[PDB]
Symmetry: C3
Subunit: 113 residues, 3 copies
């Protein structure tokens, strides 16, 4: 905070996603329902793109579900990760890579604004 | 019904998604499992595009999960929202914006049909 | 196994997704949490693309949730489907089409690798 999306890294050259870490240590239980985890990373996005926050498979398989989230092109707030412990108690350590940001083209349409 | 996708609106110019509302008042509980909510909006999509139905974050955080759904380019039926109450009883009022439609390019491949 | 993505089929010409079947008979219950189902299909993907594994709506409505999964362009392993029974006992028969692979453009960015 406030760090822009350009400070994010890719695991490897062919990785679709930019890694997102939580800035806090947080414990999640199933009965808590959706929680919004801070990343300290902020919009906006490159021109003509929008973003999608998705889970990392290794984290999904460990029982933390990330709800897919749309990041609008002109969002200037903090990108947060919407997450829920599926079945068990999940512990997120500070700096753990818990989600990924995918960049996608933003298609123009004549839809009324 | 039957309204085409062109009647949908964007919240703002840089919003990735087109808002989708339910045409009915519906109550959802966790034990009901996935439910398909009517929108009165119909395919098909613009040429060379397909659609993805995603949650709105403000609705996800209130405990209604929208399952990501693929809308095929040539689908001519009613676009429905697949939704589940996560932990608590959720009440959807008629006209509440509960999901969003994202348009994405449809890539051609040589895969057999 | 090992079959490449090019052996996948589309249901119809305008279908966004390539169908993915499980190679095993598997029973899933809610208390099992996320499970990774084998497909016998392998990366990598076409140049400048990445993949997203999504649910088929007819399967989602029957109570099997597929967690959206990112397939990296240069992944050479087996594409697995991350799935969870929502509320009830779900039985997957061998050869049942349980998910779909969507191909999307991979946008270049200056993000550090
Ligand atoms: O997982 C998410 C989803 C949304 N947002 C922020 C960016 C979006 O532009 C904004 C509004 O959300 P939606 O209406 O696009 O869902 O909230 C996030 O930080 N994380
Ligand atoms: O959330 C969804 C997902 C699918 N469909 C419709 C449009 C799709 O073209 C069709 C078949 O679904 P899939 O096989 O693409 O998942 O069902 C919806 O109305 N809502
Ligand atoms: O549903 C999924 C998600 C991921 N993967 C494989 C391909 C990805 O390239 C790799 C690493 O996963 P992620 O870090 O991209 O989530 O695991 C799958 O087989 N199925």
């Amino acid at each position: 905070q406030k760090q822009p999306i350009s400070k994010l890294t890719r695991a490897t050259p062919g990785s679709a996603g930019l890694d997102l870490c939580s800035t806090s240590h947080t414990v999640l239980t199933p009965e808590m329902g959706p929680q919004a985890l801070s990343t300290g990373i902020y919009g906006p996005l490159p021109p003509n793109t929008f973003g999608l926050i998705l889970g990392r498979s290794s984290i999904t398989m460990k029982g933390l579900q990330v709800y897919p989230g749309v990041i609008d092109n002109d969002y200037t707030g903090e990108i947060k990760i919407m997450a829920k412990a599926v079945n068990n108690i999940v512990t997120v350590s500070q700096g753990n890579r818990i989600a990924q940001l995918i960049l996608l083209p933003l298609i123009e349409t004549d839809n009324k604004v």
